Structure formats: structure tokens, C-alpha cells
From TrEMBL, chain A:
GO cellular component: catalytic step 2 spliceosome; Prp19 complex
Keywords per UniProt: Coiled coil, mRNA processing, mRNA splicing, Nucleus, Spliceosome
Coiled coil: 131-210
TM regions (residue ranges): none
Gene Ontology terms describing biological process: mRNA processing; RNA splicing
Full protein segment contained here: 26 to 235 of 303
Keyword Plastid recorded: no
The protein, known as: Pre-mRNA-splicing factor SPF27
Lineage: Eukaryota, Viridiplantae, Chlorophyta, core chlorophytes, Chlorophyceae
Subcellular location: Nucleus
Principal place of residence: nucleus
Keyword Coiled coil: yes
Family label: Belongs to the SPF27 family.
Organism, as annotated: Chlamydomonas reinhardtii (Chlamydomonas smithii)
TrEMBL record, chain B:
Keyword Lyase: no
Protein name: Uncharacterized protein
Entry keyword annotation includes Repeat: yes
A GO BP annotation: RNA splicing, via transesterification reactions
Pfam families reported in the protein's UniProt record: WD40
Domain of life from the UniProt record: Eukaryota
Cystines in this chain: 82-112
Gene source species: Chlamydomonas reinhardtii (Chlamydomonas smithii)
TrEMBL record, chain C:
Protein name stated in the entry: Uncharacterized protein
Shown stretch of the complete protein: 785 to 833 of 833
Family per similarity comment: Belongs to the CEF1 family.
Lineage of source species: Eukaryota, Viridiplantae, Chlorophyta, core chlorophytes, Chlorophyceae
Length: 210, 318, 49
């Protein structure tokens, strides 16, 4: 929960060979870190179980799906539309089952051909419109991207300007600190003159007793 | 329209102060920054407000010749006027009465500077080559040093024990007044590097730096720190002008030490950035040589005085 | 971040220039007594002869 622990990155370029040095320092930082988890998700919020305790439906759905063992495709063998086999031929209730499947697939294909004829008769401009709408979503999305890119770039530029307005003042403050250092060395030679002046005074008392 | 970041409270960013009837030789802002003391060639001092009317609410008279230099006293209610009529005068500002008129000099009292920390004491250097120190409550002059060449510009140091005087003699001198209680003291420091006369002297807001305008058309910046390199010369400015007028063209530091303004003879108000030693503002608008420029105590306001009987009073934008 | 370091380097430069002010004042009083000592030497020799 640190506040803006930052050194400006557009001013303060990280050197080439300082990547290995700063890397080793961060590594030893890690070595004796206080509570080294690398599973620190414990403090992260609890990522909860998939909430369908009121639909067994999705319950069993997930219990299988994580194992990825797929559902079989739907009833392909019945789809081949076959009448009762050898051990099912003689019994007529099996031919009732055959009535079910044969009649069902008959009207299957009938309303199928109806839908296909209905679109190839009608659907053309409907597909025209929906592909137009897919292109509309396309271009609107890239427009959002250009916008976000633009605003973010402007913010970044502002940040760079702010960085420049600071790094110059920081640099000059530090160089005048170095001049303050040489000024201190000046006052060091002043302390030299302190010693020299006292040594000079070490003659007046001499003459005074003389 | 144009909405460029009004700095000050002035009604406009450029205000011309008129009402004088002669050259305006020196000006000064009140320490509390809401008064103007303008001293003209017409031997008169206009007192202007810096805000809300710019009203010249008083014209103080009493000098018989051009009032060459004006400062305010540290509290702002007493004024020190220096003239060509050989007479320096202490006035009360609110009132319109003169307090103490000392006329000990023999010739035109060109330059003066009142001390900013300590007692009510001001230096005055005149044409007699003598720089004299003047304490308020005694009626005699407290000190009198004698150069050989007429004194053009004088200033009293920040700390209050030395006096800077520069003139026609190609070298500005720093003298020590407590070191001298005698009548022919010899100079303490010889700042050389100007190639002819010095015209204006300003003490830096920290007191380590002295500004000298020279008819060497050069502004020079020296350091007065008693522990300096062999050459105390730090900075050089080019850009302003001095001509045959040989007016008393002065110096000023912005109240922050960030800018330096010079009056020039090419009618231009020059304002350099001290650090880069280069020209920030080159303001036109004056019809006569610009005599002295003063930076407003609080805001970045610059006010200039010219030999054209007016005073421009405005703020800096950048 | 920027202004806190500008004043976090500004005030520090201020503090050791406060140092610098004290320090050159020390130089002031130093060369002062230095010249006093030179004058004392001058007069003691001028008295001795």
C-alpha cells in the first residue's frame, strides 16, 4: 500500500548493464523477503466455487467439463434412419419406433427444405444487412481503439512534459549541491586559516612575556 | 478574447504612468508593494498607488533641481530623495512633509542607497568623488570617504558594514566603514572588468552578488563574498545600450534573484534570466532612454521609468 | 512524485546553504582577526625598533 514510490522513467533511463545489477539486488531482496509466499494469493480475495448450487445442471456440467471428456454428438445412429434389425424385425412395436423415427425425419427434411427455399427465396438481403452490421461493429471497435490510443497518448505526452519540468530542476538542484560541496571545501581552507591565525596569535603572547 | 493568464491585480498588463513634466530618473516600489515613488527631472516626486486607480495621490516638492535617485526606507513610510541640487532629503510619505534635508555635498548627489537591515542609515555618492555615509538621527554626516573621480553609483551592502561605489574611474570599489574612521581611508576591494564608467549598483536579495550596469554597454555580476576566487567577476550581460546621454542608468534584481532588469538608452526595457545570462524580455514602448527599472516586491511586475516623462507599469507573461 | 522531490532537494540545498552562510560568516570573522593580528605584529616590531 505504498504511495507513489516512483522515480521518473522518461528522465531516469535505466542503464544497459544495470539490468543485471538491479536484477541481482532484487534477487537478494527476494532471498530474505519477510513472508515469501509466491502463493500470496492467500491475501488476494477468495476466488470462489462456480455458483450454481441451485442448478444441478451446471453442477454436473462443470464436474465433467474440467475433465474435458466431451458430450457425444447427438444420436447419429438413430439419425441414419433405420428400421428394426434382425432381433427387432418381427416385433411390431419396434415398427412403432420406426414410425417415430421415419416420420420424424421425413418432416425434418420437409421443413428443412422449406427453410432453405425460404432463405434462398428471401434471405439474401437479410444476410446483406447482418454482414453490414458486422462491418459496423468492426469499424466502431477500431474507432474506439483509435480514440483510446489518442487519449492515452495525450496523457502520456502530458506525463512526459511533467517529467521534463521536474528532471531539469532536480538536476540543477543536485549540481548546486555539488557546488555547495566545493563551497564546504572552501570553508575547510577557512578552517585552515583558523589554524594559521591561531598560530599567528601564538606570537603576541610570546612578545607579551618577553 | 486572448485570455493570457492575468498575473497581477492591475487593471491591465501594461500601464503607463503620466503626470511628470520632466525626465524620470529613478523610481522605487514600496516595501509593501502598493506605492510608487517616482523622481523626475522636474525636481518633484510623484507618489502613485500600484492598484485600483494608479492614483498619484501626492506630489512632493522641495528639491530645487532634478531628483536623480529615490529609494524608500525599510518601513515604507519615509523616503530618501537625492538630487542635483546638492541636497538629499528625508520625507514622510503619508504626510507630504520633509523630515531631514542634509546638503553636505558640494556637487550633484548622483547616487544613494539606504541600508536595509540595521539603523536608518543611507550612503550617498556625488560628483565630488566623495562617498558619504549618513545616519538619520545625527545632523552631521557619520562618514566621508574620498575617491578622486566623481561618484556615479553607490549601494549599501545587505549586512550593513561595507559600501560599494562605482564611477568614471573604470573600477568599482568596496570600502569598509568600520575599518575607516579616518578621512583618507584606502579602498578594500577593486572590482575591475568594466571598460568604462559604472552607472548603477544593486545589492542581490541574498547579499552575495552585486550588479553593475556600465556605459561599457555591459551588465556585470560580481560576488562580494569575502571568500571568492581571485576574480570576483561571475556574469556578463549584453544587449542594452548607453549613448551620449550618459544618463544615470541603473540595475535591478527581481525580488527572487531570477531576473535582472536594466534601463537602457535605446528606449528598451531589458530583463535577462540571470542563470542562462540571456534576454527574457525586451519590452518596447518608451520614447526616451530608460533610466531605471524596478521589480515589484511580491509579484513579477516590472515597472520602468524613462527620460520621456512617463513610467510603464506592467506584468510579465511566459 | 515530482514536486515532493523538488522540495525534498530544494529544502536540502537551502539547509546546507544556511550552512554556507554560517561558514562564510566564519571566514569573515576569521580574516578580520587575521588583519588584526597583522597589525599587532606590525606595531610590536615598529615599537621594538
Amino acid at each position: 500500500n505504498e504511495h507513489l514510490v516512483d522515480a521518473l522513467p522518461y528522465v531516469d533511463s535505466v542503464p544497459p548493464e544495470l539490468k543485471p545489477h538491479v536484477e541481482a539486488l532484487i534477487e537478494e531482496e527476494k532471498r530474505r523477503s519477510t513472508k515469501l509466499p509466491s502463493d500470496y494469493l492467500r491475501e488476494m480475495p477468495s476466488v470462489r466455487a462456480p455458483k450454481f448450487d441451485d442448478h444441478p445442471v451446471l453442477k454436473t456440467e462443470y464436474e465433467r467439463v474440467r475433465n474435458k471428456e466431451p458430450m457425444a454428438p447427438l444420436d447419429s445412429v438413430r439419425y441414419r434412419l433405420e428400421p428394426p434389425p434382425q432381433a427387432r424385425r418381427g416385433d411390431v412395436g419396434a415398427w412403432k419406433s420406426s414410425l417415430d423415427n421415419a416420420a420424424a425425419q421425413l418432416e425434418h427434411q420437409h421443413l428443412r427444405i422449406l427453410n432453405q427455399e425460404l432463405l434462398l427465396k428471401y434471405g439474401d438481403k437479410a444476410w446483406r444487412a447482418q454482414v453490414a452490421l458486422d462491418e459496423a461493429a468492426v469499424r466502431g471497435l477500431e474507432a474506439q481503439l483509435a480514440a483510446l490510443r489518442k487519449e492515452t497518448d495525450g496523457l502520456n505526452r502530458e506525463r512526459k512534459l511533467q517529467q521534463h519540468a521536474a528532471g531539469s530542476e532536480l538536476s540543477k538542484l543536485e549540481r548546486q549541491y555539488l557546488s555547495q560541496v566545493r563551497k564546504n571545501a572552501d570553508i575547510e581552507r577557512a578552517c585552515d586559516r583558523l589554524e594559521d591565525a591561531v598560530a599567528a596569535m601564538e606570537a603576541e603572547l610570546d612578545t607579551h612575556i618577553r | 478574447k486572448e485570455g493570457i493568464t492575468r498575473t497581477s491585480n492591475l487593471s491591465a498588463p501594461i500601464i503607463q504612468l503620466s503626470g511628470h513634466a520632466g525626465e524620470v530618473f529613478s523610481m522605487r516600489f514600496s516595501p509593501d508593494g502598493q506605492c510608487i515613488a517616482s523622481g523626475s527631472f522636474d525636481k518633484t516626486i510623484f507618489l502613485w498607488r500600484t492598484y485600483d486607480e494608479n492614483e498619484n495621490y501626492n506630489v512632493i516638492a522641495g528639491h530645487r533641481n532634478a531628483v536623480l535617485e529615490v529609494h524608500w526606507f525599510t518601513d515604507g513610510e519615509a523616503l530618501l530623495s537625492c538630487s542635483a541640487d546638492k541636497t538629499a532629503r528625508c520625507w514622510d510619505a503619508e504626510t507630504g512633509a520633509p523630515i531631514k534635508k542634509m546638503g553636505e555635498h558640494t556637487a550633484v548627489v548622483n547616487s544613494c542607497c539606504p541600508l536595509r537591515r540595521g539603523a536608518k542609515v543611507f550612503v550617498t555618492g556625488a560628483d565630488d568623488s566623495t562617498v558619504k555615509v549618513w545616519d538619520m538621527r545625527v545632523k552631521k554626516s557619520v562618514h566621508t570617504l574620498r575617491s578622486e573621480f566623481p561618484v556615479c553609483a553607490v549601494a549599501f551592502a545587505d549586512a550593513g558594514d561595507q559600501v560599494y561605489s562605482g564611477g568614471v574611474d573604470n573600477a568599482i570599489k568596496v570600502w569598509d566603514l568600520r575599518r575607516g574612521g579616518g578621512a583618507d581611508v584606502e579602498p578594500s576591494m577593486l572590482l575591475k572588468g568594466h571598460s568604462d564608467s559604472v552607472t548603477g549598483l544593486r545589492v542581490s536579495p541574498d547579499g552575495g552578488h552585486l550588479l553593475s550596469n556600465a556605459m561599457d554597454n555591459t551588465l556585470r555580476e560580481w560576488d562580494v563574498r569575502p571568500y571568492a576566487p581571485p576574480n570576483r567577476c561571475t556574469k556578463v550581460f549584453t544587449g542594452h545600450m548607453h549613448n551620449f546621454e550618459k544618463n544615470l542608468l541603473r540595475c535591478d534584481y527581481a525580488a527572487d534573484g531570477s531576473k535582472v532588469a536594466c534601463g537602457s538608452a535605446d528606449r528598451m526595457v531589458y530583463i535577462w534570466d540571470t542563470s542562462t545570462r540571456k534576454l527574457l524580455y525586451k519590452l518596447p514602448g518608451h520614447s526616451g532612454s530608460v533610466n531605471e527599472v524596478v521589480f515589484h516586491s511580491k509579484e513579477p511586475i516590472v515597472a520602468s521609468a524613462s527620460s520621456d516623462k512617463t513610467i510603464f507599469l506592467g506584468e510579465l507573461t511566459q | 512524485a515530482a514536486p515532493e522531490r523538488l522540495e525534498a532537494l530544494g529544502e536540502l540545498v537551502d539547509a546546507t546553504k544556511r550552512r554556507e552562510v554560517d561558514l562564510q560568516e566564519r571566514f569573515k570573522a576569521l580574516t578580520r582577526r587575521r588583519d588584526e593580528l597583522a597589525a599587532a605584529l606590525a606595531q610590536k616590531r615598529a615599537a621594538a625598533s
